[PDB]
């Protein structure tokens, strides 16, 4: 697998690339700026700037931005999490000169038209009025909240409607001018790109860029008119950099009622490790029990075969050139923002093959057993057991 080569410019912006023989490329800008860096007076600034970032910059007033990035034939995407913001474009590699330039203006000298500002306010607000339809997102945004209380991590990426209505260009300008610093930025490229050409384009454009504690808790939004119930139970994830994350991923691969997914969400030295399941009310209790059993099961039933199993499924999850440019870029941007380097797949394979059953049950015992859980329920959740009961697996 070709190595990911990283350079660093005057601004501090990093320029990471991973050349591949695929023909198109996914060039993106990551920024270490999310809802964790907001201070409850600008709780929707990143989301609302993510809406305003494609509505024209001085150089591209009006629909120019979308038009050109449309004409070139590229797909323009952006997303925001609690810790990272990404503005990425997938286009024909021959379009690199075009691409970099457009992206530059997106992350700098973006001209928020107050006309649009008002418009987006409405968009965000109205969607939020309906964002309630995404029960799963709801469950996952209180889980974050209930656990990370009194901590920036709690505030959702979207932010409270209140703030959405009460936001102004200057505030946005601040978030933009405060959390868009060049040392906290990665220009990541994946696919048919040359690293020297991308470094020269980053020098030509973009060379101008200038606590958290886990709280055991439970939030039971009871609404009996909903047909199905969604319940998430989590404990404190190790973090992004913690080595044991890998032995925890294998544990998730061992676990894999209904829609019983498993998650290991990682933030800067914290996270949520757990399971989300949707079930008819009458079975919620049973399901809860099962999940708990499985976790302690890892603590007691790490059959080597299953250990291997989990390792293998993890082995087939690692992202690679095969997965495509975007998947890879995305990994390059997150790796330079979180680890400070791109971890190659050989190092991931070494960290997977060093995992055995004994260290898996050791790492699991440290995190699942005797760890107050964070419970978030939504729907007909009367038969969902209360905390004393949940924390008390007793088996």
């Amino acid at each position: 697998v070709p190595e990911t080569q990283v350079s660093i410019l005057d601004n501090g912006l990093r320029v990471a690339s991973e050349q591949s023989s695929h023909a198109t490329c996914t060039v993106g800008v990551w920024i270490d700026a999310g809802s964790r860096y907001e201070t409850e007076k600008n709780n929707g600034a990143g989301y609302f700037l993510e809406h305003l970032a494609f509505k024209g910059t001085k150089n591209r007033p009006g629909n120019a931005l979308e038009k050109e990035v449309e004409s070139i034939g590229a797909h323009l995407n952006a997303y925001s999490t609690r810790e990272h913001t990404a503005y990425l474009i997938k286009a024909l590699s021959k379009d690199l000169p075009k691409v970099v330039e457009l992206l530059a203006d997106i992350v700098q000298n973006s001209s928020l038209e107050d006309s649009q500002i008002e418009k987006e306010r409405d968009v965000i607000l109205r969607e939020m009025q309906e964002n309630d339809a995404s029960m799963q997102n709801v469950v996952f945004d209180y889980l974050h909240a209930t656990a990370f209380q009194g901590t920036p991590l709690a505030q959702a990426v979207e932010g409270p409607s209140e703030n959405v209505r009460r936001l102004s260009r200057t505030d946005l300008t601040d978030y933009l001018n405060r959390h868009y610093k060049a040392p906290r930025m990665v220009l990541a490229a994946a696919g048919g790109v040359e690293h020297q050409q991308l470094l020269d384009l980053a020098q030509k454009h973009l060379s101008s860029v200038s606590p958290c504690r886990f709280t055991g808790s439970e939030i039971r939004h009871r609404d009996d008119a909903l047909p199905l119930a969604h319940v998430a139970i989590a404990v404190e994830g190790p973090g992004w950099a913690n080595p044991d994350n890998v032995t925890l991923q294998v544990a998730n691969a061992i676990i894999g009622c209904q829609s019983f997914q498993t998650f290991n969400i990682s933030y800067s030295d914290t996270g949520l490790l757990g399971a989300h399941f949707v079930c008819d009310a009458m079975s919620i209790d049973d399901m809860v029990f099962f999940l708990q059993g499985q976790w302690m099961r890892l603590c007691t039933s790490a059959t080597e075969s299953e250990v291997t199993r989990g390792k293998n499924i993890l082995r087939n999850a690692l992202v690679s050139h095969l997965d495509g440019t975007t998947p890879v870029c995305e990994d390059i941007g997150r790796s330079l923002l979180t680890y400070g380097r791109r971890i190659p797949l050989a190092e991931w394979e070494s960290r997977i093959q060093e995992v055995d059953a004994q260290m898996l049950r050791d790492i699991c015992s440290k995190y699942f057993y005797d760890q107050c859980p964070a419970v978030a329920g939504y729907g007909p959740i009367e038969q969902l057991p209360d905390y004393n009961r949940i924390r008390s697996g007793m088996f």
């Binding site: 057991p385 209360d386 004393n388 009961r389 008390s392």
Partner: protein, 189 residues
């Protein structure tokens, strides 16, 4: 018979001190009302062992340690405290039969109690006049417990006669009339 009790209750569930439908707020029993019952068991055992190990004869009558004199009798004979009032009631009615019947009714009046409920509210948490009548009922129950102890002579007798009259009149007459008045005050009747 108690086992029957528990069954006839789970069909309906326990009541709450507000007297309202508690279906919106119910919790498990294992971790919430079990440790509470364990604490109550511990406190009841504390009172029982300080009754046994420190004052073992404050509730009994010394007469017990006297082998029965098939021939002689205790100058002062009294039924035990728990029933003291019961007999107090008897002592009150002049007629022997009357006493026996009233005595029985004393206990039975309770059974008769579910047919005397004339209020639209189940509990007495929001019913102050019937609360006053209830505490007057507890008061003259304590009075009847005291009278039973007292010997037959003035004025213990009159109190006994009144206390019994007041007991039966509060349970039979005063509480449903008070519940009607309380329903009238809330613009319900």
């Amino acid at each position: 018979l108690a086992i029957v009790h528990l069954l006839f209750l789970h069909e309906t569930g326990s009541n709450n001190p507000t007297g309202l439908n508690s279906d919106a707020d119910k919790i498990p029993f294992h971790p919430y009302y079990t440790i509470k019952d364990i604490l109550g068991i511990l406190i009841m055992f504390l009172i029982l062992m300080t009754l046994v190990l420190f004052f073992p004869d404050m509730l009994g009558d010394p007469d017990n340690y006297m082998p029965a004199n098939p021939l002689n009798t205790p100058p002062h004979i009294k039924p035990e405290w728990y029933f003291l009032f019961a007999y107090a009631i008897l002592r009150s009615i002049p007629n022997k039969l009357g006493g026996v019947l009233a005595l029985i009714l004393s206990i039975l009046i309770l059974a008769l109690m579910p047919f005397l409920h004339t209020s639209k509210q189940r509990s007495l948490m929001f019913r102050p006049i019937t609360q006053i009548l209830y505490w007057i009922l507890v008061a003259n129950l304590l009075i009847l417990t005291w009278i039973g102890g007292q010997p037959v002579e003035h004025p213990f007798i009159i109190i006994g006669q009144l206390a019994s009259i007041s007991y039966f009149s509060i349970i039979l007459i005063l509480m449903p009339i008070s519940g009607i008045i309380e329903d009238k005050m809330l613009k319900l009747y």
